[PDB]
Structures are given as structure tokens and as C-alpha cells.
């Protein structure tokens, strides 16, 4: 089992699912085509706004 | 490829995988029929002969 946690912006986290052609999901983090398990994501705006 | 991501291309290149296999599956059985038929004359000729 692997977990990663990081912070983006409101509107990149549809970008984070395999597939999806952009800036953050070609030069920072993205997921292979085959890839098994999933993502959670929730607002954190009071905490690190 | 180019027009679409690479999770529900699965269903779109199936049946471009089975329709192209399918319909050469239907041609090699016209082929059984007729040889069947050129089998029963082959042996008619030898016994004229």
C-alpha cells in the first residue's frame, strides 16, 4: 500500500485522474493508464489559506 | 488514440478487435462449405476416369 499527500489548486485536482493532459499532470506528478486504487480530496482553506 | 484518454478506449478499440476478426471468422467458413463441394467432384472425376 502506498499513500501520497500534497496540496493543489481547486480547479487541477479533475486533472489528477490517469489520462488527462496538462501542466501538472506532464511535468510534476500523473498516474499510469493501468493504475489501481484511487484519490480523496477535501478543502483545507481554513487550515493552510 | 489521439481523440481520446486511455481508460474507456478499451471499449472503443474492442470493437474495432472483434469486427475485424469476426467477419474473417465468417469468410474461413464459406471456405469449409466450398471445399466440401469441390471434395465430393474431385472424386467423381477420378471415377470416371
Same mark, same amino acid.
Given at each position: ?49 | ?23 474473417? /471468422?465468417?469468410?474461413?467458413? /464459406? ?19
Amino acid at each position: 500500500v502506498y499513500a501520497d499527500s500534497f496540496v493543489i489548486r481547486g480547479d487541477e485536482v479533475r486533472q489528477i485522474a490517469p489520462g488527462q493532459t496538462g501542466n501538472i499532470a506532464d511535468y510534476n506528478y500523473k498516474l499510469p493508464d493501468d493504475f489501481t486504487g484511487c484519490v480523496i480530496a477535501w478543502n483545507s482553506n481554513k487550515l493552510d489559506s | 488514440f489521439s481523440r481520446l484518454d486511455k481508460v474507456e478506449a478499451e471499449v472503443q478499440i474492442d470493437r474495432l478487435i472483434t469486427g475485424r476478426l469476426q467477419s474473417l /471468422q465468417t469468410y474461413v467458413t /464459406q471456405q469449409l462449405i466450398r471445399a466440401a463441394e469441390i471434395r465430393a467432384s474431385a472424386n467423381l472425376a477420378a471415377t470416371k476416369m
